[PDB]
Design a binder for this molecule. Structure first.
Ligand SMILES: C=C1[C@H](O)CC(=C/C=C2\CCC[C@]3(C)/C(=C(/C)CCCC(C)(C)O)CC[C@@H]23)C[C@H]1O
Lengths: 240, 12
């Protein structure tokens, strides 16, 4: 069985996700409009990413144990993980019907071409879509989804981490919760090697983070493109 | 590094 502490961890992570992920996508109306007709989708997608960063932070602050870290380490973990958690949380809007992120209306349905119109190439987008399909195919329980985001954030091996032992301690508590959850609550056959597959997804995310970082560096180096970003994106991802 | 916005959002 799940211990009471493990049940507690899951309850808190579910609530945290519900408080930071609006499945109606109502706030998207506040973003600069999408334009499809260069880099025409950069203002909209920069605003989507900026908003998403704010939400990833709100979720992270609620991870049991996250508060016990120094603000320095909190910063390092959030800076390094932001794009990966956005990629993870985006799986909720992703649909394999047509390989797109469907956020409720034609205006807010993003396909491969929209992402390339934010300054990105297939070198990133092809593995990104393959990641999204592989992740969908795991048919994760919401419980597993929120634990995986939490484990993603509290990763002791991120560059610049000071108290790695404490970060590892918090991550182990989440990892063990996830393994026990799978054992007790995820029935076979769907549970077959499920934890190892979830961890492989974290590995894939590191490669996606690297390639995104490379393409973002190149994008943002052009002052006309960085003019289109937000102050939070520049602070988190880089300002040339 | 100076991350005033991230720092602000992290506040309790
Ligand atoms: C609220 C949601 C919704 O589920 C919709 C979301 C979709 C996520 C997408 C679809 C649009 C492109 C996204 C944001 C993406 C990128 C690497 C583009 C990054 C652009 C830039 C920041 C300029 O590098 C990786 C994840 C991609 C973000 C998520 O947080």
């Amino acid at each position: 069985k799940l211990s009471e502490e493990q049940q507690h961890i899951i309850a808190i992570l579910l609530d945290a996700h519900h408080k930071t992920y609006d499945p109606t996508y109502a706030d998207f109306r506040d973003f600069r409009p999408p334009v499809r007709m260069p880099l025409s989708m950069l203002p909209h997608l920069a605003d989507l990413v900026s908003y998403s960063i704010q939400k990833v932070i709100g979720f992270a602050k609620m991870i049991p144990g996250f508060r016990d870290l120094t603000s320095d380490d909190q910063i390092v973990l959030l800076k390094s993980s932001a794009i990966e958690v956005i990629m993870l949380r985006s799986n909720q809007s992703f649909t394999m019907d047509d390989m797109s992120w469907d956020c409720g209306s034609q205006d807010y349905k993003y396909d491969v071409t929209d992402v390339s119109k934010a300054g990105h190439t297939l070198e990133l987008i092809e593995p990104l879509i393959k990641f999204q399909v592989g992740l969908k195919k795991l048919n994760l329980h919401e419980e597993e989804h929120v634990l995986l985001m939490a484990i993603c954030i509290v990763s002791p091996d991120r560059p610049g981490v000071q108290d790695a032992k404490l970060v590892e301690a918090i991550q182990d508590r989440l990892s063990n919760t996830l393994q026990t959850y799978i054992r007790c609550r995820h029935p076979p056959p769907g549970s077959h090697q499920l934890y190892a597959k979830m961890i492989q997804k974290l590995a894939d995310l590191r490669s996606l983070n690297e390639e995104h970082s490379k393409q973002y560096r190149s994008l943002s180096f052009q002052p006309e493109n960085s003019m289109k970003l937000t102050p939070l994106v520049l602070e988190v991802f880089g300002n040339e | 590094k100076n991350h005033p916005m991230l720092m602000n959002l992290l506040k309790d």
